[PDB]
DNA sequence: CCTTGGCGGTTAAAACGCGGGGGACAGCGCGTACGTGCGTTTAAGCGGTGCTAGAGCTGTCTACGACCAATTGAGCGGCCTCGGCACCGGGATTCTGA
């Protein structure tokens, strides 16, 4: 049903059976990246405190860096300098250990995902990957794109000044829907000094059940949208009722201390 | 000189049982204090240029302490001396508990 092939095919827009109208994407890309960060001055290395054995697996064998590691509890994946080396299990964004996903049609609200097999809680599913914008381009491209009459906006605010677009290029995590009864959620992990957004499960999801995540509600123009799930209390509407501004939607830029002019 | 050791008697003391009240403990609903997040503002550090107070390094020389002889009286001790205080008793007053 997914069938990732590099040849472009005859499916217009819905991307349900032919995924090669747009392009896919690996770990995200940047535009104006400069060397002003906490990367390699104080977060050079954050090594866990573990005294392993690593010579007894498959018999009296505890998995390395489980839920007692200092980094997993604080949402940090280990580096290559781990005392376990190539047996540590924290590095899940680097070894690309994913979950079995599939994209078919469930409801007329749109496309989504349904679980293939059983999946336990606190299990990683997919990484949100896209194109990283910057301060000036967001408020221009959004008003340039609102006049194109599109339904889906693939914008996610990483920080108060960073918004990731998953429209031109997107992985399999772009189809996941919204519901007022969430069973998956989003977490902010720190890998190699850079912040990444991942998807974790919360319960024991049966084989053949929905996998959606809760939106932190937001609206951007004058119109409103509504959800079609209706689990038991569903808030009716994507984005709620309350209106917020262009800057509040994106997070309003950390103003370069120039001038006042930019606020006006 | 006084420490370790010994036998012996007195009775203050520690250990043992019991009743049952004191409080240590798990559990719950609730209110808001402190957090994650985030725009705007203050002023913390840089570096550059400049002045100079005050630390630092040469020279004097006499005020000050160490040392020495002779003198002798102040402080440590031995020995009686005697009264401030504990000990014991009869009694009135405080305080706790049901």
From Swiss-Prot:
Binding site for S-adenosyl-L-methionine: 109-111, 152-154, 177-178, 225, 228
Compartments where found: Nucleus; Chromosome
Binding sites annotated in the UniProt record for Zn(2+) 2: 65, 78, 82, 88
Annotated Post-SET domain residues: 223-239
Function: Histone methyltransferase that specifically trimethylates 'Lys-36' of histone H3 (H3K36me3) using dimethylated 'Lys-36' (H3K36me2) as substrate. It is capable of trimethylating unmethylated H3K36 (H3K36me0) in vitro. Represents the main enzyme generating H3K36me3, a specific tag for epigenetic transcriptional activation. Plays a role in chromatin structure modulation during elongation by coordinating recruitment of the FACT complex and by interacting with hyperphosphorylated POLR2A. (Microbial infection) Recruited to the promoters of adenovirus 12 E1A gene in case of infection, possibly leading to regulate its expression.
Subunit structure and binding partners: Specifically interacts with hyperphosphorylated C-terminal domain (CTD) of RNA polymerase II large subunit (POLR2A): binds to CTD heptad repeats doubly phosphorylated on 'Ser-2' and 'Ser-5' of each heptad. Interacts with HTT. Interacts with IWS1. Interacts with p53/TP53; leading to regulate p53/TP53 target genes. Component of a complex with HNRNPL. Interacts with TUBA1A; the interaction is independent on alpha-tubulin acetylation on 'Lys-40'. Interacts with STAT1.
Pathology linked to this chain's protein: Renal cell carcinoma: Renal cell carcinoma is a heterogeneous group of sporadic or hereditary carcinoma derived from cells of the proximal renal tubular epithelium. It is subclassified into clear cell renal carcinoma (non-papillary carcinoma), papillary renal cell carcinoma, chromophobe renal cell carcinoma, collecting duct carcinoma with medullary carcinoma of the kidney, and unclassified renal cell carcinoma. Clear cell renal cell carcinoma is the most common subtype. Luscan-Lumish syndrome: An autosomal dominant syndrome with a variable phenotype. Clinical features include macrocephaly, distinctive facial appearance, postnatal overgrowth, various degrees of learning difficulties, autism spectrum disorder, and intellectual disability.
Name this protein carries in UniProt: Histone-lysine N-methyltransferase SETD2
Source organism of this protein record: Homo sapiens (Human)
Residues of the full protein shown: 1452 to 1715 of 2564
């Amino acid at each position: 049903d997914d069938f990732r092939d590099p040849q472009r095919w005859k499916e217009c827009a819905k991307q349900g059976k032919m995924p090669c109208y747009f392009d896919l994407i690996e770990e995200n890309v940047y535009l104006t990246e400069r060397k002003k960060n906490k990367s390699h001055r104080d977060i050079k290395r954050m090594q866990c405190e573990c005294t392993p054995l690593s010579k007894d697996e498959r018999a009296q064998g505890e998995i390395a860096c489980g839920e007692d590691c200092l980094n997993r509890l604080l949402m940090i994946e280990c580096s290559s300098r781990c005392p376990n080396g190539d047996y540590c299990s924290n590095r899940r964004f680097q070894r690309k250990q994913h979950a079995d996903v599939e994209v078919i049609l469930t409801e007329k609200k749109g496309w989504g995902l349904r679980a293939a097999k059983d999946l336990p809680s606190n299990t990683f599913v997919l990484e949100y990957c896209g194109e990283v914008l910057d301060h000036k381009e967001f408020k221009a491209r959004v008003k340039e794109y609102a006049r194109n009459k599109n339904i889906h906006y693939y914008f996610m605010a990483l920080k108060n000044d960073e918004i990731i677009d998953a429209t031109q290029k997107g992985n399999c995590s772009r189809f996941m829907n919204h519901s007022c009864e969430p069973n998956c959620e989003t977490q902010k992990w720190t890998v190699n000094g850079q912040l990444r957004v991942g998807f974790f499960t919360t319960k024991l999801v049966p084989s053949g059940s929905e996998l959606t995540f809760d939106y932190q509600f937001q609206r951007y123009g004058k119109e409103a949208q509504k959800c079609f799930c209706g689990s038991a209390n569903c808030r009716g509407y994507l984005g709620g009722e309350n209106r917020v501004s262009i800057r509040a939607a994106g997070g309003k830029m950390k103003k370069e201390r120039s001038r006042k002019k930019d606020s006006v």
